[PDB]
């Protein structure tokens, strides 16, 4: 599913992500834009052989099981394919865990490089929330 900016904003809000761990909605939406272009079906393999899945590109090395990442941890207890669904629930639940992890949203390299320190509020502007 390729989400609309405001559509995703609203779903993420409904799923309790706004201000989750201090990160306003705009951050979440900004990261999803740059991680996957709002496409829930997005996948990207990495050099270590792991793969990133979904709108927030959660990694198969620690977070989800994909059957082909040796030494995977499956911290979120789910198969990676669950992260590609049009329903953002599994993505949201897993993201909550990751962000609570210690480095916050720095966990997401596009966030750190492209969102952090910017006027992220631009990302939910005009939306009806």
PDB file of C-alpha atoms in Angstrom:
ATOM      1  CA  UNK A   1       0.000   0.000   0.000  1.00  0.00           C
ATOM      2  CA  UNK A   2       1.393   3.403  -0.937  1.00  0.00           C
ATOM      3  CA  UNK A   3       0.103   5.820   1.741  1.00  0.00           C
ATOM      4  CA  UNK A   4      -0.778   9.484   1.457  1.00  0.00           C
ATOM      5  CA  UNK A   5       1.217  11.792   3.777  1.00  0.00           C
ATOM      6  CA  UNK A   6      -1.861  12.791   5.888  1.00  0.00           C
ATOM      7  CA  UNK A   7      -3.323   9.325   5.642  1.00  0.00           C
ATOM      8  CA  UNK A   8      -0.213   7.880   7.208  1.00  0.00           C
ATOM      9  CA  UNK A   9       0.026  10.703   9.726  1.00  0.00           C
ATOM     10  CA  UNK A  10      -3.521   9.906  10.884  1.00  0.00           C
ATOM     11  CA  UNK A  11      -2.909   6.248  11.186  1.00  0.00           C
ATOM     12  CA  UNK A  12       0.239   6.655  13.043  1.00  0.00           C
ATOM     13  CA  UNK A  13      -1.522   9.072  15.381  1.00  0.00           C
ATOM     14  CA  UNK A  14      -4.331   6.678  15.984  1.00  0.00           C
ATOM     15  CA  UNK A  15      -1.698   4.050  16.776  1.00  0.00           C
ATOM     16  CA  UNK A  16      -0.218   6.157  19.541  1.00  0.00           C
ATOM     17  CA  UNK A  17       3.010   7.244  17.799  1.00  0.00           C
ATOM     18  CA  UNK A  18       2.636  11.042  18.268  1.00  0.00           C
ATOM     19  CA  UNK A  19       5.013  12.096  20.955  1.00  0.00           C
ATOM     20  CA  UNK A  20       5.844   8.556  21.565  1.00  0.00           C
ATOM     21  CA  UNK A  21       9.136   8.768  23.579  1.00  0.00           C
ATOM     22  CA  UNK A  22       9.114  12.548  22.859  1.00  0.00           C
ATOM     23  CA  UNK A  23       9.042  12.312  19.031  1.00  0.00           C
ATOM     24  CA  UNK A  24       6.328  14.392  17.510  1.00  0.00           C
ATOM     25  CA  UNK A  25       4.299  12.977  14.618  1.00  0.00           C
ATOM     26  CA  UNK A  26       6.199  14.950  12.042  1.00  0.00           C
ATOM     27  CA  UNK A  27       9.295  12.987  12.886  1.00  0.00           C
ATOM     28  CA  UNK A  28       7.580   9.680  12.252  1.00  0.00           C
ATOM     29  CA  UNK A  29       6.139  10.772   9.044  1.00  0.00           C
ATOM     30  CA  UNK A  30       9.390  12.339   7.899  1.00  0.00           C
ATOM     31  CA  UNK A  31      11.221   9.127   8.588  1.00  0.00           C
ATOM     32  CA  UNK A  32       8.655   7.049   6.634  1.00  0.00           C
ATOM     33  CA  UNK A  33       8.947   9.350   3.732  1.00  0.00           C
ATOM     34  CA  UNK A  34      12.643   8.905   3.467  1.00  0.00           C
ATOM     35  CA  UNK A  35      12.850   5.298   4.503  1.00  0.00           C
ATOM     36  CA  UNK A  36      10.379   3.870   2.050  1.00  0.00           C
ATOM     37  CA  UNK A  37       8.631   6.667   0.280  1.00  0.00           C
ATOM     38  CA  UNK A  38       5.397   5.816   2.219  1.00  0.00           C
ATOM     39  CA  UNK A  39       5.332   2.337   0.489  1.00  0.00           C
ATOM     40  CA  UNK A  40       4.454  -0.500   2.930  1.00  0.00           C
ATOM     41  CA  UNK A  41       5.833  -3.006   0.412  1.00  0.00           C
ATOM     42  CA  UNK A  42       9.395  -1.584   0.411  1.00  0.00           C
ATOM     43  CA  UNK A  43      12.347  -3.951   0.889  1.00  0.00           C
ATOM     44  CA  UNK A  44      16.088  -3.294   0.703  1.00  0.00           C
ATOM     45  CA  UNK A  45      18.777  -5.845   1.247  1.00  0.00           C
ATOM     46  CA  UNK A  46      21.919  -4.849   3.055  1.00  0.00           C
ATOM     47  CA  UNK A  47      25.493  -5.947   2.745  1.00  0.00           C
ATOM     48  CA  UNK A  48      25.469  -7.876   5.949  1.00  0.00           C
ATOM     49  CA  UNK A  49      22.730  -9.952   4.261  1.00  0.00           C
ATOM     50  CA  UNK A  50      20.001  -8.536   6.346  1.00  0.00           C
ATOM     51  CA  UNK A  51      16.954  -6.853   4.759  1.00  0.00           C
ATOM     52  CA  UNK A  52      14.854  -3.792   5.750  1.00  0.00           C
ATOM     53  CA  UNK A  53      11.079  -4.080   5.487  1.00  0.00           C
ATOM     54  CA  UNK A  54       8.080  -1.742   5.251  1.00  0.00           C
ATOM     55  CA  UNK A  55       7.351   1.946   5.615  1.00  0.00           C
ATOM     56  CA  UNK A  56       9.873   2.278   8.403  1.00  0.00           C
ATOM     57  CA  UNK A  57      12.329  -0.168   6.969  1.00  0.00           C
ATOM     58  CA  UNK A  58      12.747  -2.346  10.062  1.00  0.00           C
ATOM     59  CA  UNK A  59      15.787  -4.574   9.882  1.00  0.00           C
ATOM     60  CA  UNK A  60      15.800  -8.335   9.753  1.00  0.00           C
ATOM     61  CA  UNK A  61      19.110  -8.550  11.807  1.00  0.00           C
ATOM     62  CA  UNK A  62      17.442  -7.713  15.166  1.00  0.00           C
ATOM     63  CA  UNK A  63      13.788  -7.061  14.840  1.00  0.00           C
ATOM     64  CA  UNK A  64      11.858  -9.523  12.696  1.00  0.00           C
ATOM     65  CA  UNK A  65      12.324 -13.039  11.309  1.00  0.00           C
ATOM     66  CA  UNK A  66      12.784 -13.433   7.572  1.00  0.00           C
ATOM     67  CA  UNK A  67      14.219 -16.891   7.489  1.00  0.00           C
ATOM     68  CA  UNK A  68      17.360 -15.878   5.856  1.00  0.00           C
ATOM     69  CA  UNK A  69      19.303 -13.643   8.311  1.00  0.00           C
ATOM     70  CA  UNK A  70      21.608 -16.004  10.298  1.00  0.00           C
ATOM     71  CA  UNK A  71      21.899 -14.999  13.793  1.00  0.00           C
ATOM     72  CA  UNK A  72      18.635 -12.930  13.558  1.00  0.00           C
ATOM     73  CA  UNK A  73      17.235 -11.881  17.017  1.00  0.00           C
ATOM     74  CA  UNK A  74      13.501 -11.376  16.209  1.00  0.00           C
ATOM     75  CA  UNK A  75      13.122  -8.878  19.030  1.00  0.00           C
ATOM     76  CA  UNK A  76       9.693  -7.878  17.768  1.00  0.00           C
ATOM     77  CA  UNK A  77       8.468 -11.512  17.491  1.00  0.00           C
ATOM     78  CA  UNK A  78       7.022 -11.383  14.072  1.00  0.00           C
ATOM     79  CA  UNK A  79       7.838 -12.416  10.585  1.00  0.00           C
ATOM     80  CA  UNK A  80       9.233  -9.575   8.507  1.00  0.00           C
ATOM     81  CA  UNK A  81       6.459  -9.983   6.000  1.00  0.00           C
ATOM     82  CA  UNK A  82       4.001  -8.726   8.619  1.00  0.00           C
ATOM     83  CA  UNK A  83       5.724  -5.332   8.221  1.00  0.00           C
ATOM     84  CA  UNK A  84       4.641  -5.057   4.612  1.00  0.00           C
ATOM     85  CA  UNK A  85       0.928  -5.205   5.250  1.00  0.00           C
ATOM     86  CA  UNK A  86      -1.431  -2.258   4.508  1.00  0.00           C
ATOM     87  CA  UNK A  87      -2.334  -2.304   8.183  1.00  0.00           C
ATOM     88  CA  UNK A  88       0.452  -0.480   9.993  1.00  0.00           C
ATOM     89  CA  UNK A  89      -0.112  -2.112  13.369  1.00  0.00           C
ATOM     90  CA  UNK A  90       2.822  -4.559  13.423  1.00  0.00           C
ATOM     91  CA  UNK A  91       5.102  -1.805  12.059  1.00  0.00           C
ATOM     92  CA  UNK A  92       3.957   0.571  14.789  1.00  0.00           C
ATOM     93  CA  UNK A  93       4.377  -1.969  17.629  1.00  0.00           C
ATOM     94  CA  UNK A  94       7.785  -2.914  16.495  1.00  0.00           C
ATOM     95  CA  UNK A  95       8.853   0.725  15.986  1.00  0.00           C
ATOM     96  CA  UNK A  96       7.822   1.479  19.598  1.00  0.00           C
ATOM     97  CA  UNK A  97      10.235  -1.175  20.784  1.00  0.00           C
ATOM     98  CA  UNK A  98      13.082  -0.015  18.605  1.00  0.00           C
ATOM     99  CA  UNK A  99      12.750   3.646  19.605  1.00  0.00           C
ATOM    100  CA  UNK A 100      12.706   2.691  23.313  1.00  0.00           C
ATOM    101  CA  UNK A 101      15.959   0.902  22.681  1.00  0.00           C
ATOM    102  CA  UNK A 102      18.427   3.550  23.691  1.00  0.00           C
ATOM    103  CA  UNK A 103      19.419   5.582  20.617  1.00  0.00           C
ATOM    104  CA  UNK A 104      15.921   6.716  19.985  1.00  0.00           C
ATOM    105  CA  UNK A 105      15.050   7.542  16.414  1.00  0.00           C
ATOM    106  CA  UNK A 106      18.772   7.584  15.575  1.00  0.00           C
ATOM    107  CA  UNK A 107      18.019   3.913  14.952  1.00  0.00           C
ATOM    108  CA  UNK A 108      16.776   5.074  11.600  1.00  0.00           C
ATOM    109  CA  UNK A 109      19.632   6.390   9.506  1.00  0.00           C
ATOM    110  CA  UNK A 110      17.329   8.391   7.076  1.00  0.00           C
ATOM    111  CA  UNK A 111      15.814  10.053  10.173  1.00  0.00           C
ATOM    112  CA  UNK A 112      19.210  11.034  11.534  1.00  0.00           C
ATOM    113  CA  UNK A 113      20.441  12.214   8.141  1.00  0.00           C
ATOM    114  CA  UNK A 114      17.374  13.816   6.780  1.00  0.00           C
ATOM    115  CA  UNK A 115      14.879  14.537   9.505  1.00  0.00           C
ATOM    116  CA  UNK A 116      16.707  15.250  12.665  1.00  0.00           C
ATOM    117  CA  UNK A 117      17.061  18.941  13.317  1.00  0.00           C
ATOM    118  CA  UNK A 118      14.735  19.923  10.570  1.00  0.00           C
ATOM    119  CA  UNK A 119      11.309  21.517  10.824  1.00  0.00           C
ATOM    120  CA  UNK A 120       9.566  18.160  10.912  1.00  0.00           C
ATOM    121  CA  UNK A 121       6.247  19.770  11.615  1.00  0.00           C
ATOM    122  CA  UNK A 122       6.122  20.498   7.884  1.00  0.00           C
ATOM    123  CA  UNK A 123       5.323  16.797   7.408  1.00  0.00           C
ATOM    124  CA  UNK A 124       1.877  16.967   8.997  1.00  0.00           C
ATOM    125  CA  UNK A 125       0.980  20.375   7.846  1.00  0.00           C
ATOM    126  CA  UNK A 126      -2.423  20.708   6.333  1.00  0.00           C
ATOM    127  CA  UNK A 127      -3.568  17.406   7.592  1.00  0.00           C
ATOM    128  CA  UNK A 128      -6.783  16.955   9.482  1.00  0.00           C
ATOM    129  CA  UNK A 129      -5.737  15.269  12.707  1.00  0.00           C
TER     130      UNK A 129
END
